[PDB]
Amino acid sequence: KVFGRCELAAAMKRHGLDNYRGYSLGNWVCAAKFESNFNTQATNRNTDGSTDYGILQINSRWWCNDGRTPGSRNLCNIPCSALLSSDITASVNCAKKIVSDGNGMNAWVAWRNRCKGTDVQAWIRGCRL
Ligand SMILES: [Cl-]
Ligand SMILES: [Cl-]
Ligand SMILES: [Cl-]
Ligand SMILES: [Cl-]
Ligand code: NA
Ligand SMILES: [Ru+3]
Ligand SMILES: [Ru+3]
């Protein structure tokens, strides 16, 4: 599923991401924009052989099981394919664990490079939230 911007903002809010760990909703929408272009089916291979999955590009090295990332963990206790669903529940629940890990949203390199320190409220501007 390719979400609309405001559609994704509303889903993320309903699932408790608004201000989770202090990160306003615009931060999460901005991260999703640059990680996946709002496409739940996005997958991308990393140089280390792991793969990133879903609207927040969650990495099989630590967070989900894809059966093909040697020596990895599955700290969200989910198959990576569950992160590709039209229903964002699994991605949100796993993102909550990731952002609590110590480095906040810096875990998402694209958030640090493209969202951090910008006017992230623009990503929810106009949305009926
Ligand atoms: Cl915001
Ligand atoms: Cl594996
Ligand atoms: Cl699995
Ligand atoms: Cl933080
Ligand atoms: Na894994
Ligand atoms: Ru839902
Ligand atoms: Ru850690």
Curated annotation (Swiss-Prot):
Pfam families: Lys
Localization per record: Secreted
Stated role: Lysozymes have primarily a bacteriolytic function; those in tissues and body fluids are associated with the monocyte-macrophage system and enhance the activity of immunoagents. Has bacteriolytic activity against M.luteus.
One GO CC term on file: endoplasmic reticulum
Family per record: Belongs to the glycosyl hydrolase 22 family.
InterPro entries recorded: Glyco_hydro_22, Glyco_hydro_22_CS, Glyco_hydro_22_lys, Lysozyme-like_dom_sf
Native source species: Gallus gallus
Disulfides per UniProt: C6-C127, C30-C115, C64-C80, C76-C94
Name of this protein: Lysozyme C
Quaternary structure and partners: Monomer.
